Design a protein around this ligand. Structure first.
Ligand SMILES: [Mn+2]
Ligand SMILES: [Mn+2]
Ligand SMILES: [Mn+2]
Ligand SMILES: [Mn+2]
Lengths: 130, 130
């Protein structure tokens, strides 16, 4: 659909999960945008049936859950392959909305690959040493 | 060094390697943008000393070479993990300029990990089957 719209749904979903609701102020503060800009996006999200304070439609909820899943999987992926922890978040934030579901699912299989045998993680770590 | 600037340097570097030179028209066609947009960017890259008959400076060449390496490595990464070939290019294009060097290097180690022992690739493929 749209990276910005997705980023908003992701943030709105997280806020609802964290607080039980999503205030415009909290959205604007989390995205570091002006509250007026949030107002415009919300009205658009409303028109597109992602939501109706504000409440997500089942359509918006399904997307939010997917976006959180993708963010979490990507952090786990970068963490597993050894990226410095402090750099993981910004990298995930910048690539998460530009990956196809095919890539996401293959990354999921990759994470599973390393999780079923610690020897694989060690072998990968050895390569980093080289 | 914005993502847009990097994408232009990447394209300019590729055109020079492919044809021996980079015409505004070819850059405009490759990026699917208006020539005025290209001109504005080129003037900016000139001001920032990446280029000067578009000719890259050593600064621009170093970056261009890195960007091509990164693009190729990212395609190999998605390829190795099983992403459908047809979807690889668009994914790489959208994430390549949003990954830290730390992530790129660890992805490089990951690619090396699979390339050095095909048994690892087979094991990864078995998981995709589950
Ligand atoms: Mn996001
Ligand atoms: Mn995220
Ligand atoms: Mn690019
Ligand atoms: Mn590229």
């Amino acid at each position: 659909t749209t990276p910005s719209m997705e980023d908003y749904i992701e943030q709105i979903y997280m806020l609802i999960e964290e607080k039980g609701y999503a205030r415009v102020s909290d959205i604007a503060e989390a995205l570091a945008v002006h509250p007026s800009s949030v107002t415009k996006m919300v009205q658009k999200l409303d028109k597109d049936e992602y939501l109706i304070g504000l409440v997500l439609t089942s359509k918006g909820k399904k997307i939010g859950k997917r976006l959180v899943y993708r963010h979490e999987l990507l952090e786990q992926f970068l963490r597993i392959i050894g990226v410095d922890e402090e750099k993981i978040y910004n990298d995930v934030e910048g690539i998460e909305h530009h990956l196809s579901w095919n890539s996401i699912d293959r990354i999921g299989d990759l994470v599973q690959y390393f999780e079923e045998d610690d020897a694989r993680k060690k072998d990968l770590k050895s390569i980093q040493k080289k």
